[PDB]
Amino acid sequence: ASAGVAVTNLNLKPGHCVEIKGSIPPDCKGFAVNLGEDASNFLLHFNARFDLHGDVNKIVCNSKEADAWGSEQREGVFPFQQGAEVMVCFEYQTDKIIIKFSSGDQFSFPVRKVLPSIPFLSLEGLQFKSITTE
Amino acid sequence: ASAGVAVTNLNLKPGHCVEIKGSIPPDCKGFAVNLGEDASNFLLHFNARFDLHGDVNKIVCNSKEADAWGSEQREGVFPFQQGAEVMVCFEYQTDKIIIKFSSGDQFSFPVRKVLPSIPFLSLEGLQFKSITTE
């Protein structure tokens, strides 16, 4: 809303990727990028937390099924700074989604539901600059 | 009707613009780019008609309020070719929307309802590559 674009009919199929460019509000405790079927089912919820729910400078990744959050996965890397810009790429593969940052860092997250395509994308706490898929 | 990628909470403000990049299918009768508040209320409906509604290689712009279309503005320039990629920018000013083409072609359409920001964007018949805001 404030910072929360939603893309529908994304049509992201295996072997393709979507890159997001945004800027992080100074008053932001964290931002999230969600990839899924709709607002209640996320294949991937990528949440960079600066100071949120007890996590300080930690990336929490999870899936959501029918509004019930899955098994969280946490990552050590955190190449973000408030007020700075952000460039993340998500590469969708049938067996995993690989997240890459402009910083050169990368990690993978398991695909818990093989979908023919990912129709929905939404951002939270991120001021949208550009979205592009290949 | 829209049918293609849709973006909500785009919230394009006066003085800013969106750049849309995509591919025109090789058998495209026409395509459209919509900016408004929702699917039934458009500040601008930009329809490039290759062979559609009796029009051949025509650009027809109009607004829509509660599903009722307003008065059409027709343009003489048609800088598009089927099967090719399009790059079109929309600058939002309070008195008008300037429509710019990569080909340098440019024209404006009047703002018939001044909104503090445009929250919705939708594509029709165009294969999406990137959406960028400035």
Ligand SMILES: CC(=O)N[C@@H]1[C@@H](O)[C@H](O[C@@H]2O[C@H](CO)[C@H](O)[C@H](O)[C@H]2O)[C@@H](CO)O[C@@H]1O
């Ligand atoms: C250590 C731990 O278990 N922490 C969790 C929180 O992460 C969790 O917060 C939600 O987490 C999901 C992702 O799994 C979304 O980020 C959501 O926005 C968060 O509120 C809460 C609630 O499930 O439980 C523990 O605190």
Ligand SMILES: CC(=O)N[C@@H]1[C@@H](O)[C@H](O[C@@H]2O[C@H](CO)[C@H](O)[C@H](O)[C@H]2O)[C@@H](CO)O[C@@H]1O
């Ligand atoms: C010559 C003429 O008046 N033609 C119009 C059509 O343009 C019009 O088609 C609709 O046009 C709006 C744009 O103003 C949208 O593109 C819509 O999708 C079209 O169906 C029709 C119907 O309103 O009216 C005349 O035929």
